[PDB]
Write a protein that binds this ligand. Structure first.
Ligand code: Z79
Ligand code: CA
Ligand code: CA
Ligand code: CA
Ligand code: ZN
Ligand code: ZN
Length: 158
């Protein structure tokens, strides 16, 4: 399906979870974009105003799309593939407790997966892939994409 047909992509953080320090939210999301820019020709820039390609949102329950959140647990986040408007946007369930670490739900690891969707990736059947639909914490300091993730993204870009 859809892919971004340009190399410079913008994102904007619509609002901030009260679960984390603001700078930690910024850094998690930045690091998650870097995972993908490492392996494609894409460049990502955070903008503070205006229409971004990728809007990052924290919201709970019904929040104006067809993908209502479900309280703590279950669905952690969802994202829309490349396109105009809501296309590219990544939404994180505020009913989760977002963290920089192994506690609650790790924002960085979740964001890597969601941004994969924002770039056009679907799910992987390989438990080793970040694009596998089940959340499982792994050490974020040594995190690496699986070969399956890299194959998937390189099928769309570069
Ligand atoms: C590692 O990243 C994620 C992100 C979300 C989920 S999930 O919310 O539990 N499943 C729905 C989903 O795949 N959303 O993109 C599971 C893992
Ligand atoms: Ca949930
Ligand atoms: Ca968008
Ligand atoms: Ca929360
Ligand atoms: Zn949503
Ligand atoms: Zn997913």
């Amino acid at each position: 399906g859809p892919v971004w047909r340009k190399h410079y992509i913008t994102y904007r953080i619509n609002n901030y979870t009260p679960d984390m320090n603001r700078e930690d939210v910024d850094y998690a999301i930045r690091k998650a974009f870097q995972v993908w820019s490492n392996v494609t020709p894409l460049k990502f820039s955070k903008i503070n105003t205006g229409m971004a390609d990728i809007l990052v949102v924290f919201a709970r329950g019904a929040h104006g799309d067809d993908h209502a959140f479900d309280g703590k647990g279950g669905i952690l986040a969802h994202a829309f593939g490349p396109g105009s408007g809501i296309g590219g946007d990544a939404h994180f369930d505020e009913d989760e407790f977002w963290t920089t670490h192994s506690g609650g739900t790790n924002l960085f690891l979740t964001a890597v997966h969601e941004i994969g969707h924002s770039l056009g990736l679907g799910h992987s059947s390989d438990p080793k892939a970040v694009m596998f639909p089940t959340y499982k914490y792994v050490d974020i300091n040594t995190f690496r994409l699986s070969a399956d993730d890299i194959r998937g993204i390189q099928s769309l870009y570069g």
